[PDB]
Amino acid sequence: AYLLFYTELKVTVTVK
Amino acid sequence: AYLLFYTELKVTVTVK
Amino acid sequence: AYLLFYTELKVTVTVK
Amino acid sequence: AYLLFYTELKVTVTVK
Amino acid sequence: AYLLFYTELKVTVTVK
Amino acid sequence: AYLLFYTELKVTVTVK
Amino acid sequence: AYLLFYTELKVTVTVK
Amino acid sequence: AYLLFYTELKVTVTVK
Protein backbone atom coordinates (compact mmCIF):
# COMPACT_ATOMS: atom_id res chain seq x y z
CA ALA A 1 0.00 0.00 0.00
CA TYR A 2 1.02 3.64 -0.49
CA LEU A 3 0.82 6.47 2.00
CA LEU A 4 -0.74 9.43 0.22
CA PHE A 5 -0.40 13.02 1.34
CA TYR A 6 -3.12 15.42 0.22
CA THR A 7 -2.32 19.01 0.96
CA GLU A 8 -4.73 21.92 1.44
CA LEU A 9 -1.35 24.39 4.88
CA LYS A 10 -2.59 21.06 6.24
CA VAL A 11 -2.20 17.51 5.00
CA THR A 12 -4.53 14.55 4.96
CA VAL A 13 -2.58 11.31 5.24
CA THR A 14 -4.26 8.18 3.92
CA VAL A 15 -3.15 4.61 3.28
CA LYS A 16 -4.20 2.93 0.10
CA ALA B 1 -7.45 4.28 6.06
CA TYR B 2 -6.30 7.53 7.69
CA LEU B 3 -3.19 8.13 9.74
CA LEU B 4 -4.24 10.05 12.85
CA PHE B 5 -1.91 12.11 14.97
CA TYR B 6 -2.94 12.67 18.59
CA THR B 7 -0.79 15.18 20.37
CA GLU B 8 -0.14 15.50 24.10
CA LEU B 9 4.84 17.49 23.25
CA LYS B 10 4.49 13.91 22.00
CA VAL B 11 2.30 12.35 19.34
CA THR B 12 0.50 9.05 19.14
CA VAL B 13 0.26 7.88 15.54
CA THR B 14 -2.52 5.44 14.72
CA VAL B 15 -3.97 4.00 11.52
CA LYS B 16 -7.69 3.76 11.16
CA ALA C 1 13.16 22.11 17.87
CA TYR C 2 9.99 20.00 18.05
CA LEU C 3 7.76 18.90 15.21
CA LEU C 4 4.18 19.60 16.25
CA PHE C 5 1.16 17.92 14.74
CA TYR C 6 -2.14 19.81 14.99
CA THR C 7 -5.09 17.75 13.93
CA GLU C 8 -8.46 18.95 12.62
CA LEU C 9 -9.07 14.51 9.57
CA LYS C 10 -6.09 16.60 8.47
CA VAL C 11 -2.90 17.59 10.23
CA THR C 12 -0.86 20.77 10.23
CA VAL C 13 2.81 20.00 10.76
CA THR C 14 4.96 22.80 12.14
CA VAL C 15 8.51 23.05 13.47
CA LYS C 16 9.15 25.03 16.58
CA ALA D 1 8.01 26.79 9.98
CA TYR D 2 5.65 24.41 8.18
CA LEU D 3 6.43 21.03 6.69
CA LEU D 4 4.92 20.95 3.21
CA PHE D 5 4.12 17.79 1.31
CA TYR D 6 3.97 18.08 -2.48
CA THR D 7 2.63 14.99 -4.13
CA GLU D 8 3.24 13.77 -7.69
CA LEU D 9 2.76 8.58 -6.19
CA LYS D 10 5.75 10.28 -4.55
CA VAL D 11 6.02 13.20 -2.17
CA THR D 12 8.50 16.02 -1.87
CA VAL D 13 8.84 17.12 1.74
CA THR D 14 10.09 20.64 2.34
CA VAL D 15 10.38 22.91 5.38
CA LYS D 16 9.39 26.51 5.06
CA ALA E 1 4.45 -4.29 8.50
CA TYR E 2 7.25 -1.84 7.69
CA LEU E 3 6.95 1.62 6.22
CA LEU E 4 9.51 1.89 3.42
CA PHE E 5 10.85 5.14 2.06
CA TYR E 6 12.21 5.06 -1.49
CA THR E 7 13.98 8.22 -2.45
CA GLU E 8 14.54 9.65 -5.94
CA LEU E 9 14.46 14.74 -4.08
CA LYS E 10 11.11 12.98 -3.59
CA VAL E 11 10.12 9.94 -1.59
CA THR E 12 7.70 7.12 -2.26
CA VAL E 13 6.23 5.83 0.99
CA THR E 14 4.88 2.29 0.96
CA VAL E 15 3.65 -0.14 3.61
CA LYS E 16 4.73 -3.72 3.42
CA ALA F 1 -3.00 -0.01 14.57
CA TYR F 2 -0.07 2.06 15.87
CA LEU F 3 2.94 3.29 13.96
CA LEU F 4 6.01 2.50 16.06
CA PHE F 5 9.34 4.23 15.70
CA TYR F 6 12.40 2.31 16.89
CA THR F 7 15.51 4.39 16.95
CA GLU F 8 19.13 3.23 16.73
CA LEU F 9 20.65 7.84 14.29
CA LYS F 10 18.20 5.83 12.17
CA VAL F 11 14.62 4.78 12.76
CA THR F 12 12.72 1.62 11.92
CA VAL F 13 9.07 2.40 11.29
CA THR F 14 6.62 -0.45 11.75
CA VAL F 15 2.83 -0.75 11.85
CA LYS F 16 1.24 -2.89 14.47
CA ALA G 1 20.15 18.25 11.02
CA TYR G 2 18.56 14.93 12.01
CA LEU G 3 14.97 14.24 12.92
CA LEU G 4 14.98 12.15 16.09
CA PHE G 5 12.11 9.99 17.23
CA TYR G 6 11.92 9.23 20.95
CA THR G 7 9.34 6.64 21.80
CA GLU G 8 7.53 6.12 25.10
CA LEU G 9 3.11 4.22 22.58
CA LYS G 10 3.81 7.87 21.71
CA VAL G 11 6.72 9.55 19.99
CA THR G 12 8.47 12.84 20.56
CA VAL G 13 9.84 14.21 17.30
CA THR G 14 12.71 16.66 17.56
CA VAL G 15 15.10 18.26 15.08
CA LYS G 16 18.73 18.49 15.94
CA ALA H 1 15.00 22.94 3.14
CA TYR H 2 14.22 19.34 2.14
CA LEU H 3 13.64 16.38 4.40
CA LEU H 4 15.72 13.50 3.05
CA PHE H 5 15.07 9.86 3.80
CA TYR H 6 18.03 7.50 3.49
CA THR H 7 17.06 3.89 3.73
CA GLU H 8 19.22 0.93 4.79
CA LEU H 9 14.94 -1.70 6.83
CA LYS H 10 15.65 1.54 8.69
CA VAL H 11 15.64 5.15 7.59
CA THR H 12 17.83 8.10 8.47
CA VAL H 13 15.86 11.33 8.29
CA THR H 14 17.85 14.51 7.76
CA VAL H 15 16.97 18.12 6.99
CA LYS H 16 18.98 19.97 4.42
Side-chain angles (χ1 to χ4, degrees), chain A residues 4-8 10-15:
Chain A
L4 299 173
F5 297 82
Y6 180 67
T7 293
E8 297 165 299
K10 327 172 179 184
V11 68
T12 301
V13 313
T14 54
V15 178

PDB file of all heavy atoms in Angstrom, chain A residues 4-15, unseen atoms left out:
ATOM      1  N   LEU A   4      -0.411   8.315   1.094  1.00  0.00           N
ATOM      2  CA  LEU A   4      -0.744   9.433   0.216  1.00  0.00           C
ATOM      3  C   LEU A   4      -0.992  10.664   1.047  1.00  0.00           C
ATOM      4  O   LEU A   4      -1.708  10.622   2.059  1.00  0.00           O
ATOM      5  CB  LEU A   4      -1.991   9.106  -0.611  1.00  0.00           C
ATOM      6  CG  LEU A   4      -1.735   7.869  -1.488  1.00  0.00           C
ATOM      7  CD1 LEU A   4      -3.028   7.447  -2.177  1.00  0.00           C
ATOM      8  CD2 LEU A   4      -0.648   8.169  -2.509  1.00  0.00           C
ATOM      9  N   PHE A   5      -0.328  11.737   0.666  1.00  0.00           N
ATOM     10  CA  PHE A   5      -0.399  13.015   1.339  1.00  0.00           C
ATOM     11  C   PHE A   5      -1.135  14.020   0.472  1.00  0.00           C
ATOM     12  O   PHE A   5      -0.715  14.386  -0.635  1.00  0.00           O
ATOM     13  CB  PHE A   5       1.041  13.520   1.619  1.00  0.00           C
ATOM     14  CG  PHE A   5       1.844  12.659   2.536  1.00  0.00           C
ATOM     15  CD1 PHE A   5       2.523  11.524   2.140  1.00  0.00           C
ATOM     16  CD2 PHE A   5       1.990  13.008   3.872  1.00  0.00           C
ATOM     17  CE1 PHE A   5       3.278  10.756   3.055  1.00  0.00           C
ATOM     18  CE2 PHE A   5       2.742  12.243   4.775  1.00  0.00           C
ATOM     19  CZ  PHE A   5       3.432  11.107   4.382  1.00  0.00           C
ATOM     20  N   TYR A   6      -2.282  14.485   0.960  1.00  0.00           N
ATOM     21  CA  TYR A   6      -3.124  15.422   0.218  1.00  0.00           C
ATOM     22  C   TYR A   6      -3.115  16.743   0.925  1.00  0.00           C
ATOM     23  O   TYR A   6      -3.639  16.873   2.020  1.00  0.00           O
ATOM     24  CB  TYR A   6      -4.549  14.881   0.158  1.00  0.00           C
ATOM     25  CG  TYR A   6      -5.535  15.757  -0.585  1.00  0.00           C
ATOM     26  CD1 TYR A   6      -5.443  15.958  -1.960  1.00  0.00           C
ATOM     27  CD2 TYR A   6      -6.576  16.343   0.082  1.00  0.00           C
ATOM     28  CE1 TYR A   6      -6.346  16.754  -2.645  1.00  0.00           C
ATOM     29  CE2 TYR A   6      -7.491  17.151  -0.588  1.00  0.00           C
ATOM     30  CZ  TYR A   6      -7.360  17.352  -1.947  1.00  0.00           C
ATOM     31  OH  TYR A   6      -8.290  18.131  -2.583  1.00  0.00           O
ATOM     32  N   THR A   7      -2.534  17.739   0.297  1.00  0.00           N
ATOM     33  CA  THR A   7      -2.319  19.006   0.960  1.00  0.00           C
ATOM     34  C   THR A   7      -3.376  20.028   0.574  1.00  0.00           C
ATOM     35  O   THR A   7      -3.745  20.177  -0.591  1.00  0.00           O
ATOM     36  CB  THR A   7      -0.917  19.522   0.639  1.00  0.00           C
ATOM     37  OG1 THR A   7       0.045  18.639   1.236  1.00  0.00           O
ATOM     38  CG2 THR A   7      -0.703  20.957   1.080  1.00  0.00           C
ATOM     39  N   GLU A   8      -3.797  20.785   1.579  1.00  0.00           N
ATOM     40  CA  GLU A   8      -4.730  21.915   1.436  1.00  0.00           C
ATOM     41  C   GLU A   8      -4.216  23.050   2.300  1.00  0.00           C
ATOM     42  O   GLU A   8      -4.298  23.052   3.518  1.00  0.00           O
ATOM     43  CB  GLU A   8      -6.146  21.581   1.864  1.00  0.00           C
ATOM     44  CG  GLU A   8      -6.778  20.504   1.022  1.00  0.00           C
ATOM     45  CD  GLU A   8      -8.012  19.952   1.693  1.00  0.00           C
ATOM     46  OE1 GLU A   8      -7.872  19.399   2.806  1.00  0.00           O
ATOM     47  OE2 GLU A   8      -9.161  20.089   1.154  1.00  0.00           O
ATOM     48  N   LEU A   9      -3.536  24.013   1.621  1.00  0.00           N
ATOM     49  CA  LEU A   9      -1.352  24.395   4.883  1.00  0.00           C
ATOM     50  C   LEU A   9      -1.309  23.061   5.740  1.00  0.00           C
ATOM     51  O   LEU A   9      -0.388  22.734   6.500  1.00  0.00           O
ATOM     52  CB  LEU A   9      -1.007  24.019   3.469  1.00  0.00           C
ATOM     53  CG  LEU A   9      -1.444  25.129   2.473  1.00  0.00           C
ATOM     54  N   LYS A  10      -2.415  22.315   5.572  1.00  0.00           N
ATOM     55  CA  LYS A  10      -2.594  21.057   6.240  1.00  0.00           C
ATOM     56  C   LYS A  10      -2.483  19.897   5.275  1.00  0.00           C
ATOM     57  O   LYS A  10      -2.532  20.085   4.038  1.00  0.00           O
ATOM     58  CB  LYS A  10      -4.002  21.020   6.821  1.00  0.00           C
ATOM     59  CG  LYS A  10      -4.614  22.342   7.317  1.00  0.00           C
ATOM     60  CD  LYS A  10      -6.090  22.113   7.666  1.00  0.00           C
ATOM     61  CE  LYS A  10      -6.799  23.362   8.188  1.00  0.00           C
ATOM     62  NZ  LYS A  10      -8.220  23.072   8.602  1.00  0.00           N
ATOM     63  N   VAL A  11      -2.357  18.697   5.822  1.00  0.00           N
ATOM     64  CA  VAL A  11      -2.197  17.513   4.998  1.00  0.00           C
ATOM     65  C   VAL A  11      -3.101  16.420   5.515  1.00  0.00           C
ATOM     66  O   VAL A  11      -3.203  16.216   6.728  1.00  0.00           O
ATOM     67  CB  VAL A  11      -0.709  17.100   4.884  1.00  0.00           C
ATOM     68  CG1 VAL A  11      -0.124  16.598   6.194  1.00  0.00           C
ATOM     69  CG2 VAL A  11      -0.528  16.077   3.764  1.00  0.00           C
ATOM     70  N   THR A  12      -3.773  15.741   4.599  1.00  0.00           N
ATOM     71  CA  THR A  12      -4.530  14.547   4.956  1.00  0.00           C
ATOM     72  C   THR A  12      -3.685  13.327   4.617  1.00  0.00           C
ATOM     73  O   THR A  12      -3.250  13.230   3.463  1.00  0.00           O
ATOM     74  CB  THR A  12      -5.819  14.525   4.173  1.00  0.00           C
ATOM     75  OG1 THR A  12      -6.572  15.719   4.471  1.00  0.00           O
ATOM     76  CG2 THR A  12      -6.668  13.342   4.494  1.00  0.00           C
ATOM     77  N   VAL A  13      -3.440  12.435   5.573  1.00  0.00           N
ATOM     78  CA  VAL A  13      -2.577  11.310   5.243  1.00  0.00           C
ATOM     79  C   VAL A  13      -3.400  10.012   5.204  1.00  0.00           C
ATOM     80  O   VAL A  13      -3.982   9.635   6.232  1.00  0.00           O
ATOM     81  CB  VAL A  13      -1.387  11.193   6.197  1.00  0.00           C
ATOM     82  CG1 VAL A  13      -0.703  12.527   6.407  1.00  0.00           C
ATOM     83  CG2 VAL A  13      -0.407  10.166   5.653  1.00  0.00           C
ATOM     84  N   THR A  14      -3.495   9.405   4.047  1.00  0.00           N
ATOM     85  CA  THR A  14      -4.258   8.184   3.923  1.00  0.00           C
ATOM     86  C   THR A  14      -3.355   7.034   3.489  1.00  0.00           C
ATOM     87  O   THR A  14      -2.230   7.233   3.022  1.00  0.00           O
ATOM     88  CB  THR A  14      -5.438   8.315   2.974  1.00  0.00           C
ATOM     89  OG1 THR A  14      -4.971   8.793   1.727  1.00  0.00           O
ATOM     90  CG2 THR A  14      -6.515   9.237   3.515  1.00  0.00           C
ATOM     91  N   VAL A  15      -3.840   5.819   3.682  1.00  0.00           N
ATOM     92  CA  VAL A  15      -3.150   4.609   3.275  1.00  0.00           C
ATOM     93  C   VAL A  15      -4.054   3.942   2.275  1.00  0.00           C
ATOM     94  O   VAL A  15      -5.227   3.689   2.571  1.00  0.00           O
ATOM     95  CB  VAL A  15      -2.949   3.649   4.454  1.00  0.00           C
ATOM     96  CG1 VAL A  15      -2.257   2.347   3.987  1.00  0.00           C
ATOM     97  CG2 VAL A  15      -2.182   4.321   5.555  1.00  0.00           C
TER      98      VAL A  15
END
